[PDB]
Design an enzyme around this catalytic site. Structure first.
Site, PDB file in Angstrom:
ATOM      1  N   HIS A 262       0.911  -1.031   0.120  1.00  0.00           N
ATOM      2  CA  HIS A 262      -0.179  -0.173   0.062  1.00  0.00           C
ATOM      3  C   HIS A 262       0.711   1.389  -0.026  1.00  0.00           C
ATOM      4  O   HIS A 262       1.936   1.220   0.849  1.00  0.00           O
ATOM      5  CB  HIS A 262      -0.832  -0.027   1.318  1.00  0.00           C
ATOM      6  CG  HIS A 262      -2.175   0.979   1.098  1.00  0.00           C
ATOM      7  ND1 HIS A 262      -2.028   2.159   1.167  1.00  0.00           N
ATOM      8  CD2 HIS A 262      -3.448   0.620   0.914  1.00  0.00           C
ATOM      9  CE1 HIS A 262      -3.289   2.784   1.058  1.00  0.00           C
ATOM     10  NE2 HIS A 262      -3.944   1.815   0.913  1.00  0.00           N
TER      11      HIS A 262
ATOM     12  N   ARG B 121      -3.203   0.802  -3.762  1.00  0.00           N
ATOM     13  CA  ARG B 121      -2.811  -0.446  -4.146  1.00  0.00           C
ATOM     14  C   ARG B 121      -3.449  -0.968  -5.515  1.00  0.00           C
ATOM     15  O   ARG B 121      -4.263  -0.196  -5.909  1.00  0.00           O
ATOM     16  CB  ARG B 121      -3.423  -1.349  -2.876  1.00  0.00           C
ATOM     17  CG  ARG B 121      -4.702  -1.105  -2.356  1.00  0.00           C
ATOM     18  CD  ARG B 121      -5.120  -1.890  -1.313  1.00  0.00           C
ATOM     19  NE  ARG B 121      -6.146  -1.278  -0.624  1.00  0.00           N
ATOM     20  CZ  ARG B 121      -7.079  -2.169   0.140  1.00  0.00           C
ATOM     21  NH1 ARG B 121      -6.886  -3.404   0.531  1.00  0.00           N
ATOM     22  NH2 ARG B 121      -7.881  -1.486   0.921  1.00  0.00           N
TER      23      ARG B 121
ATOM     24  N   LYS C  25      -7.502  -1.092  -7.272  1.00  0.00           N
ATOM     25  CA  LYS C  25      -8.320  -0.205  -6.483  1.00  0.00           C
ATOM     26  C   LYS C  25      -8.645   0.955  -7.346  1.00  0.00           C
ATOM     27  O   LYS C  25      -8.391   0.981  -8.591  1.00  0.00           O
ATOM     28  CB  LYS C  25      -7.982  -0.090  -5.086  1.00  0.00           C
ATOM     29  CG  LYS C  25      -8.005  -1.427  -4.301  1.00  0.00           C
ATOM     30  CD  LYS C  25      -8.611  -1.254  -2.659  1.00  0.00           C
ATOM     31  CE  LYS C  25     -10.033  -0.938  -2.646  1.00  0.00           C
ATOM     32  NZ  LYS C  25     -10.462  -0.658  -1.528  1.00  0.00           N
TER      33      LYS C  25
ATOM     34  N   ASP D 142      -7.056   8.241  -6.244  1.00  0.00           N
ATOM     35  CA  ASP D 142      -7.216   9.054  -5.270  1.00  0.00           C
ATOM     36  C   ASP D 142      -6.179  10.066  -4.996  1.00  0.00           C
ATOM     37  O   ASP D 142      -5.024   9.797  -4.831  1.00  0.00           O
ATOM     38  CB  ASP D 142      -7.356   8.149  -3.887  1.00  0.00           C
ATOM     39  CG  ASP D 142      -7.619   9.022  -2.526  1.00  0.00           C
ATOM     40  OD1 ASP D 142      -7.256  10.145  -2.588  1.00  0.00           O
ATOM     41  OD2 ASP D 142      -8.343   8.649  -1.687  1.00  0.00           O
TER      42      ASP D 142
ATOM     43  N   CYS E 249      -4.773  11.936  -2.702  1.00  0.00           N
ATOM     44  CA  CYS E 249      -3.781  11.978  -1.850  1.00  0.00           C
ATOM     45  C   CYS E 249      -2.720  10.929  -2.008  1.00  0.00           C
ATOM     46  O   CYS E 249      -1.760  11.204  -1.612  1.00  0.00           O
ATOM     47  CB  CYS E 249      -4.476  11.715  -0.385  1.00  0.00           C
ATOM     48  SG  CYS E 249      -5.136  10.249  -0.138  1.00  0.00           S
ATOM     49  N   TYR E 250      -3.080   9.988  -2.981  1.00  0.00           N
ATOM     50  CA  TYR E 250      -1.994   9.081  -3.219  1.00  0.00           C
ATOM     51  C   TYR E 250      -1.054   9.862  -4.364  1.00  0.00           C
ATOM     52  O   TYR E 250      -0.192   9.567  -4.768  1.00  0.00           O
ATOM     53  CB  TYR E 250      -2.381   8.002  -4.053  1.00  0.00           C
ATOM     54  CG  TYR E 250      -3.173   7.074  -2.995  1.00  0.00           C
ATOM     55  CD1 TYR E 250      -2.515   6.864  -1.876  1.00  0.00           C
ATOM     56  CD2 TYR E 250      -4.354   6.758  -3.268  1.00  0.00           C
ATOM     57  CE1 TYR E 250      -3.334   6.047  -0.907  1.00  0.00           C
ATOM     58  CE2 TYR E 250      -5.160   5.911  -2.261  1.00  0.00           C
ATOM     59  CZ  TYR E 250      -4.385   5.805  -0.985  1.00  0.00           C
ATOM     60  OH  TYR E 250      -5.197   4.978  -0.117  1.00  0.00           O
TER      61      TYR E 250
ATOM     62  N   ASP F 211     -10.320  13.721  -2.945  1.00  0.00           N
ATOM     63  CA  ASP F 211      -9.816  12.361  -3.385  1.00  0.00           C
ATOM     64  C   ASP F 211     -10.305  12.171  -4.767  1.00  0.00           C
ATOM     65  O   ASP F 211      -9.723  11.907  -5.682  1.00  0.00           O
ATOM     66  CB  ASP F 211     -11.067  11.339  -2.368  1.00  0.00           C
ATOM     67  CG  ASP F 211     -11.142  10.017  -3.161  1.00  0.00           C
ATOM     68  OD1 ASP F 211     -10.362   9.709  -4.171  1.00  0.00           O
ATOM     69  OD2 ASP F 211     -11.782   9.257  -2.567  1.00  0.00           O
TER      70      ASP F 211
ATOM     71  N   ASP G 157     -11.814  17.959   2.446  1.00  0.00           N
ATOM     72  CA  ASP G 157     -11.448  17.807   3.496  1.00  0.00           C
ATOM     73  C   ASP G 157      -9.962  18.431   3.655  1.00  0.00           C
ATOM     74  O   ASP G 157      -9.510  18.576   2.627  1.00  0.00           O
ATOM     75  CB  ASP G 157     -11.535  16.481   4.062  1.00  0.00           C
ATOM     76  CG  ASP G 157     -10.903  15.332   3.242  1.00  0.00           C
ATOM     77  OD1 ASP G 157      -9.622  15.362   3.364  1.00  0.00           O
ATOM     78  OD2 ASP G 157     -11.542  14.721   2.711  1.00  0.00           O
TER      79      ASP G 157
ATOM     80  N   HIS H 198      -7.307  15.725   2.328  1.00  0.00           N
ATOM     81  CA  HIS H 198      -6.959  15.595   0.983  1.00  0.00           C
ATOM     82  C   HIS H 198      -6.410  17.234   0.437  1.00  0.00           C
ATOM     83  O   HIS H 198      -5.751  17.146  -0.740  1.00  0.00           O
ATOM     84  CB  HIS H 198      -8.328  15.150   0.415  1.00  0.00           C
ATOM     85  CG  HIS H 198      -8.385  13.772   0.335  1.00  0.00           C
ATOM     86  ND1 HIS H 198      -8.905  13.290   1.309  1.00  0.00           N
ATOM     87  CD2 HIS H 198      -7.870  12.783  -0.368  1.00  0.00           C
ATOM     88  CE1 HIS H 198      -9.084  11.959   1.236  1.00  0.00           C
ATOM     89  NE2 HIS H 198      -8.643  11.516  -0.047  1.00  0.00           N
TER      90      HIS H 198
HETATM   91  C1  LIG Z   1      -6.216   1.413   6.238  1.00  0.00           C
HETATM   92  C2  LIG Z   1      -5.225   1.979   4.954  1.00  0.00           C
HETATM   93  C3  LIG Z   1      -5.793   2.316   3.830  1.00  0.00           C
HETATM   94  C4  LIG Z   1      -7.206   2.180   3.782  1.00  0.00           C
HETATM   95  O1  LIG Z   1      -7.336   2.140   2.404  1.00  0.00           O
HETATM   96  P1  LIG Z   1      -8.902   2.258   1.906  1.00  0.00           P
HETATM   97  O2  LIG Z   1      -9.650   0.862   1.555  1.00  0.00           O
HETATM   98  O3  LIG Z   1      -9.541   3.061   2.990  1.00  0.00           O
HETATM   99  O4  LIG Z   1      -8.573   3.153   0.781  1.00  0.00           O
HETATM  100  P2  LIG Z   1      -7.621   2.346  -0.640  1.00  0.00           P
HETATM  101  O5  LIG Z   1      -8.797   1.709  -1.508  1.00  0.00           O
HETATM  102  O6  LIG Z   1      -6.689   1.441  -0.036  1.00  0.00           O
HETATM  103  O7  LIG Z   1      -7.326   3.968  -1.313  1.00  0.00           O
HETATM  104  C5  LIG Z   1      -3.557   2.322   5.180  1.00  0.00           C
HETATM  105  C6  LIG Z   1      -2.903   3.453   4.327  1.00  0.00           C
HETATM  106  C7  LIG Z   1      -2.387   4.421   4.943  1.00  0.00           C
HETATM  107  C8  LIG Z   1      -2.475   5.717   4.569  1.00  0.00           C
HETATM  108  C9  LIG Z   1      -3.589   6.081   3.489  1.00  0.00           C
HETATM  109  C10 LIG Z   1      -1.583   6.773   5.370  1.00  0.00           C
HETATM  110  N1  LIG Z   1      -0.333   6.914   5.670  1.00  0.00           N
HETATM  111  C11 LIG Z   1      -0.254   7.624   6.825  1.00  0.00           C
HETATM  112  O8  LIG Z   1      -1.036   8.254   7.379  1.00  0.00           O
HETATM  113  C12 LIG Z   1       1.331   7.946   7.302  1.00  0.00           C
HETATM  114  C13 LIG Z   1       1.384   8.099   8.855  1.00  0.00           C
HETATM  115  C14 LIG Z   1       2.459   8.979   9.263  1.00  0.00           C
HETATM  116  C15 LIG Z   1       1.751  10.127  10.449  1.00  0.00           C
HETATM  117  C16 LIG Z   1       2.139  11.467   9.878  1.00  0.00           C
HETATM  118  S1  LIG Z   1       1.595  12.851  10.952  1.00  0.00           S
HETATM  119  C17 LIG Z   1       1.780  14.118   9.713  1.00  0.00           C
HETATM  120  C18 LIG Z   1       1.219  13.373   8.342  1.00  0.00           C
HETATM  121  N2  LIG Z   1      -0.099  13.402   8.247  1.00  0.00           N
HETATM  122  C19 LIG Z   1      -0.875  12.526   8.052  1.00  0.00           C
HETATM  123  O9  LIG Z   1      -1.877  12.197   7.935  1.00  0.00           O
HETATM  124  N3  LIG Z   1       0.213  11.329   8.141  1.00  0.00           N
HETATM  125  C20 LIG Z   1       1.567  11.729   8.507  1.00  0.00           C
HETATM  126 ZN   LIG Z   2      -7.501   9.688  -0.023  1.00  0.00          ZN
END
Ligand SMILES: C/C(=C\COP(=O)(O)OP(=O)(O)O)CC/C=C(\C)CNC(=O)CCCC[C@@H]1SC[C@@H]2NC(=O)N[C@@H]21
Ligand SMILES: [Zn+2]
Lengths: 315, 402
Positions: free
Chosen positions: B226, B269, B272, B275, B277-278, B330, B337, B340
């Protein structure tokens, strides 16, 4: 007890049985930033939550209150922490707690904190009996839920429950052969049970993946799996492969086929085979096809692969 | 005729389902359906691409100060909101007034736990996510008032308290482990100069066990790859200077494949959906890879461009991710928000700005006022702020030391 959506709901500050306790207003200071104008219900609940947390009141009413604080903001990790302290203190029936956390997960399946909570109950009870079936219900609604798969892998690894997992994988692959979470799970099971060196197994797997690729040439997941099993050992180790793919090409020819071929030629040059300067050309002809016609979004990636082959496989 | 997504040959990038429909295929076709409308609209009975700066600014300005109850569910993520808003103001090039800077500081100070780190709000327990966000925010402010808010001794204890035998870190006490937490520890530890010889022992090896058969990295060993975990993985290793642990070639094959041939954006990933923010989590991996293949002599690297279609990413962000009210999304027909708004902008900046050794080469679609300030791809705050802070904390000794 008195649910937050009940017509009869009463703010904590008007409940007689809370009269002894003074609520603790949040300290945002004189002129706050990112200030949230909370609803009346919310601010009332959290005002009382702060009063119990601060007194460290390990009580039944404190416990029923955490439930409300969670219902309003399920991501408050501080509140979930406090709730676990109370399950230890008040010695609550952890099975009752399993029933609670199941409902909440069904309601908010994408929250981190709710799954973390569930896992701690399982560690406490040492009881995996419901896990795989519960997870299967959530997966039935969202087949790609990352946290559900993460919990499944943890339960399997931990309580060694590998025996039916491949049949589950196979059921889901039938339902949606593009679900990359399932392809990853397939690999997770196999690599931890039989391994991929049992040539009987590595055959059935490669056979199967081509069978899927035939039905759905443009499904990337399968191509990534094929590559990812064979790539361990080196693709030039499997001479039939080059030609078996070349046979798919006039019909089933995705841009993934082309890119696989490049990966094969790449491995051949790397192993000093016959026709060096011939094969180095069939490769570069594909790099240019991809970069310039069949896959231009990755124009930069393929121009770089082209320039890597040259710089490595010449004089 | 000069916009990539509007060229007639681009109609060919549409999904081919091979006549076999699944949920995945049906959903991908629906987005491609919507995104087609957006594109055939920009051409109708020619015009440019504009980044709606004033609108994005008003949204941000107002949010930094105050929020409706719709935002109750972010009540344990306030420092994180601060960071999202300041980073976007910083990218859009907006000086932060001093009384705002000062208010941010005093606020983060009330979030600071007496045993170290920051929590989501005043008097909450500490957690690594708001801790990195708070530190990042203080750096964006970049003053001494801000730098001094951070209690470095207590930060280091907190971090030891989360460190596991096997190299990983908890997110919070009694919390769970994943690669995000390692990134967070590495990000805060390295900007504040608190790395001890043993703090990250085992960490880079733990991260590499997370790289999987696909090339990307998953949240913990065994898990699907991911974009969010991958970025944290790579970036944490770049901080520790152990990029070599990973198979960088497979990581490259994986990320580049996550750009979507039709939409122009990134998915998080495989198989999917696109989006916004990717645009940062996936596309910010290319700068990290570029600097890593380069520190191993790779002579095939470019010196104008990163290894993604920068043009097509910019077109996705400008045409599909902007809310006319202000802020970003997104994808079309979602609602805006701050998360994003922050990461779509961070990604637009990255697709705009190439830099490698002494090369610099910008690419700015639409009007030239669209250019953003550059962002540092490890930390996702401005490269100057990064320098200024590292330099400043390097003046004090690692604690438990001299
Ligand atoms: C459970 C998951 C995704 C869920 O995917 P989904 O099915 O909801 O959506 P998708 O279909 O996979 O796009 C894991 C993915 C992780 C991220 C999108 C985000 N990565 C982070 O948030 C990094 C964490 C590091 C913390 C710092 S604090 C300042 C900065 N801001 C922030 O939001 N995070 C960082
Ligand atoms: Zn997003």
């Amino acid at each position: 007890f008195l649910s937050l959506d009940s017509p009869t709901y009463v703010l904590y500050r008007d409940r007689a049985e809370w009269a002894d306790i003074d609520p603790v207003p949040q300290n945002d200071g004189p002129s706050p930033v990112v200030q949230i104008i909370y609803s009346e219900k919310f601010r009332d609940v959290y005002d009382y939550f702060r009063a119990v947390l601060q007194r460290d009141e390990r009580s039944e009413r404190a416990f029923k209150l955490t439930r409300d604080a969670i219902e309003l903001n399920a991501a408050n990790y501080t509140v979930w922490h406090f709730r676990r302290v109370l399950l230890r203190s008040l010695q609550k029936d952890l099975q009752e707690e399993m029933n609670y956390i199941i409902a909440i997960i069904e309601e908010q399946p994408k929250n981190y904190q709710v799954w973390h909570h569930r896992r701690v109950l399982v560690e406490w009870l040492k009881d995996p009996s419901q896990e795989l079936e519960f997870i299967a219900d959530i997966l039935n609604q969202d087949a790609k839920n990352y946290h559900a798969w993460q919990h499944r892998q943890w339960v399997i690894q931990e309580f060694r429950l590998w025996d039916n997992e491949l049949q589950y994988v196979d059921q889901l692959l039938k339902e949606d052969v593009r679900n990359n979470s399932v392809w990853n799970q397939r690999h997770f099971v196999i690599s931890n049970t039989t391994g991929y060196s049992d040539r009987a197994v590595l055959e059935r797997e490669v056979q199967y993946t081509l069978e899927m690729i035939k039905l759905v040439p443009h499904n990337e997941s399968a191509w990534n799996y094929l590559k990812g099993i064979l790539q361990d050992r080196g693709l030039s180790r499997y001479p039939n492969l080059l030609n078996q793919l070349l046979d798919l090409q006039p019909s089933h020819s995705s841009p993934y086929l082309i890119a696989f071929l490049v990966d094969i030629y790449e491995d051949m040059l790397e192993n000093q085979c016959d026709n060096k300067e011939d094969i180095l050309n069939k490769a570069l002809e594909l790099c240019e096809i991809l970069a310039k016609e069949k896959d231009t979004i990755r124009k930069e990636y393929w121009r770089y692969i082209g320039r890597s082959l040259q710089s490595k496989h010449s004089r | 005729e000069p916009l990539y997504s509007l060229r007639p040959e681009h109609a060919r990038e549409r999904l081919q389902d091979d006549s076999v429909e699944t949920v995945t295929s049906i959903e991908q076709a629906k987005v491609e359906e919507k995104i087609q409308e957006v594109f055939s609209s920009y051409k109708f009975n020619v015009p440019r691409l504009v980044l709606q700066r004033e609108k994005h600014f008003h949204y941000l300005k107002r949010g930094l100060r105050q929020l409706t109850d719709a935002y109750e569910c972010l009540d344990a993520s306030r420092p994180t909101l601060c960071y999202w808003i300041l980073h976007s103001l910083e990218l859009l090039d907006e000086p932060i007034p001093q009384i705002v800077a000062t208010d941010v500081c005093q606020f983060l100070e009330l979030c600071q736990s007496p045993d170290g780190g920051f929590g989501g709000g005043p008097g909450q327990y500490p957690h690594l996510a708001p801790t990195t966000a708070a530190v990042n925010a203080l750096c964006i402010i970049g003053t001494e008032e801000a730098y001094n808010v951070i209690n470095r001794e207590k930060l280091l204890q907190y971090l030891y308290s989360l460190k596991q035998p096997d190299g990983s870190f908890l997110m919070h006490v009694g919390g769970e482990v994943d690669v995000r937490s390692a990134y967070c520890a590495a990000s805060v530890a390295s900007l504040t100069n608190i790395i001890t010889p043993d703090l990250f022992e085992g960490t880079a090896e733990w991260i590499a066990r997370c790289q999987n058969w696909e090339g990307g990295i998953g949240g913990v060993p065994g898990m699907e790859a991911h974009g969010g975990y991958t970025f944290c993985g790579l970036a944490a290793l770049v901080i520790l200077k152990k990029e070599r642990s990973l198979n960088l070639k497979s990581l490259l094959q994986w990320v580049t494949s996550r750009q979507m041939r039709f939409e122009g954006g990134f998915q998080g990933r495989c198989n999917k959906l696109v989006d916004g923010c990717y645009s940062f989590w996936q596309a910010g991996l290319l700068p990290l890879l570029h600097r890593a293949l380069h520190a191993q002599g790779d002579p095939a690297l470019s010196m104008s461009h990163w290894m993604f279609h920068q043009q097509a990413l910019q077109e996705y962000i400008l045409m599909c991710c902007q809310c006319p009210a202000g802020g970003l999304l997104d994808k079309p027909g979602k609602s805006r928000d701050f998360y994003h708004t922050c990461y779509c902008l961070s990604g637009l900046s990255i697709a705009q700005h190439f830099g490698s050794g002494a090369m610099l080469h910008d690419v700015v679609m639409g009007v030239p006022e669209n250019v953003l300030q550059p962002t540092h791809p490890v930390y996702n705050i401005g490269p100057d702020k990064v320098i200024q802070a590292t330099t400043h904390f390097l003046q004090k000794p690692v604690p438990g030391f001299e």
